[PDB]
Design a protein around this ligand. Structure first.
Ligand SMILES: C=CCO[C@@]1(C(=O)O)O[C@H]([C@H](O)CO)[C@H](O)[C@H](O)[C@@H]1O
Ligand SMILES: [Zn+2]
Lengths: 217, 217
């Protein structure tokens, strides 16, 4: 029976920097007949299917950039990325095939980039939703770094924090940013009792919040 | 050219059964083992079983976690693979992948399909409501709010795919058994609203196709 641990669970590296992730087997995956290690690496990009990178531990698959090197033997294996590109954002899986197949838990690779401020957009409920009796107010915080970020919703100057759901995107594969959406949901009636709607974005890129507002006007 | 396509995914009640299919093309089917792999959202891949090729007489192997509960079979006249799933539970909820496996030489899952998502829930299929997000700068940002559907997934495009860059689709969040997500699109303020912008949203669970034009407020 074969147990695959992977290490680390996650890390972030800057473009150009080097990257090593590890793969432990509970037993040797060396087939003495073929003298090969039955160990493969898969890259799985956000939203995408797993793609093959390396098989037999060391063998790189066609199309795969040379910056990707698979190493090791026995019970210890490693995927090295020599000069990381933004496109390299993904979870990497090792998998043995010496005794059926077993995947490791994965190494999630994030990219480090310079801090960048969010572009913030606010949107009032559509009249379609309203006539149906609901009021969702939505706020986009796009293309910022780093991920950590706080949103404040304020109605007529007072912070409401119920009815608010937040959602972050995977990191962007090109520009290495993150975007976040924040939706405050109210009944139409409650929405109609108030005048000013404000999305307040607090990010380390500025001591001052980014402030987008609309009036039910 | 090699193709693998999974189908059959969607909502099944707990205790229920479901069979998935995997249609293939562009390679010699009977030469290959074929594998099924799953992945609970935000989680690791898990190999579940294969059925060997023609050389080994199309025998099946299973991971201990589904051995006895899941069944694999292939139709060699059609280049098609199946996974029969019984007595489903919540932890069976996951994207399911067919993958081309062993052929006699290489130890690699050379190709994978797009995957099909299976949700095991007593909750009921609910079609989404789709709302326009309409709003100064040189770029302008629009959105569509896809609210209250079940189960996952939905797809969002902008102008039937012809608007691909500057698009952020946010991961759905769950609440009272309804998912909610948004997609933002950023275009030159030059172009809107002089040029129509429309989101195209699909929810296969409910055969829902929605087009929504973003019209100025
Ligand atoms: C004679 C071939 C055996 O192949 C299989 C098989 O079919 O069972 O067994 C191989 C083992 O190395 C044999 O000791 C591999 O795991 C291979 O991928 C496959 O699972
Ligand atoms: Zn057997």
């Amino acid at each position: 029976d074969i147990v695959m641990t992977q290490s680390p669970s996650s890390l972030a590296v800057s473009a150009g920097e080097k990257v090593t992730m590890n793969c432990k087997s509970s037993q040797s995956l060396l087939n003495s007949r073929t003298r090969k290690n039955y160990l493969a690496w898969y890259q799985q990009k956000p939203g995408q299917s797993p793609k093959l990178l390396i098989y037999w531990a060391s063998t790189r698959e066609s199309g795969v950039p040379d910056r990707f090197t698979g190493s090791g033997s026995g019970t210890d294996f490693a995927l090295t990325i020599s000069s990381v590109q933004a496109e390299d954002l993904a979870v990497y899986y090792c998998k043995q095939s010496y005794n059926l197949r077993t995947f490791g838990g994965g190494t999630k690779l994030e990219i480090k980039r310079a801090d960048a401020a969010p572009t913030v957009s606010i949107f009032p409920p559509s009249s379609e939703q309203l006539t149906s009796g609901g009021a969702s107010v939505v706020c986009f915080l796009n293309n910022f770094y780093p991920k950590d970020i706080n949103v404040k919703w304020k109605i007529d100057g007072s912070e409401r924090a119920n009815g608010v759901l937040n959602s972050w995107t995977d990191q962007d594969s090109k520009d290495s940013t993150y975007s976040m959406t924040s939706t405050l949901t109210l009944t139409k009636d409650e929405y109609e009792r108030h005048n000013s709607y404000t999305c307040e974005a607090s990010h380390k890129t500025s001591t001052s919040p980014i402030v987008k507002s609309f009036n039910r006007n | 050219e090699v193709k693998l396509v999974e189908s059959g995914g969607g909502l099944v009640q707990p205790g229920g059964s479901l069979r998935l299919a995997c249609a293939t093309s562009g390679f010699t089917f009977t030469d290959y083992y074929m594998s099924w792999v799953r992945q609970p959202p935000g989680k690791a891949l898990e190999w579940l079983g294969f059925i060997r090729n023609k050389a080994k007489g199309y025998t099946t192997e299973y991971s201990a976690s589904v051995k006895g509960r899941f069944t694999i079979s292939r139709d060699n006249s059609q280049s098609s693979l199946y996974l029969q799933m019984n007595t489903l539970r919540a932890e069976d909820s996951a994207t399911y992948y067919c993958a081309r496996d062993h052929d006699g030489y290489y130890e690699r899952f050379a190709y994978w399909g797009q995957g099909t998502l299976v949700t095991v829930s007593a909750a009921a299929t609910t079609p989404p409501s789709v709302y326009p997000l309409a709003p100064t700068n040189s770029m302008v940002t629009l959105g569509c709010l896809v609210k209250g559907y079940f189960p996952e997934p939905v797809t969002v495009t902008w102008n039937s795919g012809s608007l691909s860059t500057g698009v952020h689709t946010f991961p759905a969040v769950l609440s009272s058994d309804l998912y909610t997500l948004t997609s933002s699109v950023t275009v030159p303020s030059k172009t809107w609203p002089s040029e129509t912008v429309t989101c195209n949203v699909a929810h296969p669970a409910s055969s829902t196709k929605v087009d929504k034009k973003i019209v100025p407020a």
